[PDB]
Amino acid sequence: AGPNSDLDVNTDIYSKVLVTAIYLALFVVGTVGNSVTLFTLARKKSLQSLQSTVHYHLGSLALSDLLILLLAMPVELYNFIWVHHPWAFGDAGCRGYYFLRDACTYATALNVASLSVARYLAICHPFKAKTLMSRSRTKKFISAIWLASALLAIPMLFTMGLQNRSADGTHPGGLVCTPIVDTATVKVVIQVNTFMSFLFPMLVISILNTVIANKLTVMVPGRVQALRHGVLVLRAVVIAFVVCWLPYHVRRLMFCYISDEQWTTFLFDFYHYFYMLTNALFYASSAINPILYNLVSANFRQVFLSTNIFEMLRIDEGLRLKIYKDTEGYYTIGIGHLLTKSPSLNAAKSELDKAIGRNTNGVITKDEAEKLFNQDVDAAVRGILRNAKLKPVYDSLDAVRRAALINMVFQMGETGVAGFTNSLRMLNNKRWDEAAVNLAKSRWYNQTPNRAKRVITTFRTGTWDAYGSGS
């Protein structure tokens, strides 16, 4: 019992080590992962401007994560886990530490959020996407968010401070880095920090990633197995964010909102144990992010190891690289792309050359086929969403049946499918069997009966029963 006997934190030797070992494991895994990532994204050098934007945002994320681990952890391990008093890094050490910590933190939260926006635009607004962001415009946006991170961390230079809390006036063992302004200001700072680096991005992420996942689910067996993992990764990313960051913000808020008359030896002891738990998870974020945001990638799988409607239509329309005549006698190419209704084969050919911008002679590549396909599906969903008679029906449907509606619009057009007035109300009211019986009575069903029945079957079951042929 001396003048700094009160500053003593009582965490058992067991815990302190178990936590050190954990921390040091995260430190190797995380610093490697984020570095390897930086190395691996540098040499990729993609051609597409949409996929390279993502590579930039991902690079930014990996740096801000690396920097958390390198700047926040060493000092935490010495001064907040093992040796709580005295603070051994001076007044400017105290101010600089919380500045940097919060900056990297802000930079990660904003990164993760901006990335989610980027992906929302790429997929849901592809027209604007290409016209709204290219290599130089994102490079500048990444800069905007490191400056913004830097600005939002400035308050921590003015609110943290070195201070002697010894019983005695001032013994050198009683110096501690801690907030040193009116609880009123500390309470407001803290809550801003909590809103601007947890709540705000929480919504952005949690909403946009759910909208992407759902949309990407409908857009989409070996051929597409990676895109289905991507969907799972997207839902995982939110889960990872909440679990790893919420308890860290809970703990900061408890630090300031529990008043002096309420602090006991019990809560005080419980805090510093909780501190161990919340900060382990906090850092885990930085260690997992590289391996989570990049596991579904192509080479990357190897790399660290070296240290609905697409499917349905690909069955129903097939893939041909040379010009053919469809069911009805019209020249078509690729995956169901109708070129023209004119009986002239030169008219088709002319129209094809026009479609891609190259003197094909009536033959195309697999990549060209898929380029046209993505455009025609874009076209079919816009048709549905702007149509008074199809949008309500589409909205009411699960992901599998939505695709089956897109199948019909792909084959027949917006205004074609719109004529199925009674079958569409049945679908909208979940009368799956009635709809199916009624769809089977149509001209569409006589013209192309296998395809029709597969779609019909999909409508009545919501299963993949009809598409065993899919790869």
């Binding site: 009160d6 500053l7 934190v9 907040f80 709580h84 919380y98 943290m160 809390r165 501690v176 801690t178 907030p179 900061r252 630090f255 529990i258 002096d260 602090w263 030896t265 005080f268 805090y271 510093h272 501190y275």
Partner: peptide, 6 residues
Amino acid sequence: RRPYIL
């Protein structure tokens, strides 16, 4: 006696 480590 409250915590000083934020």
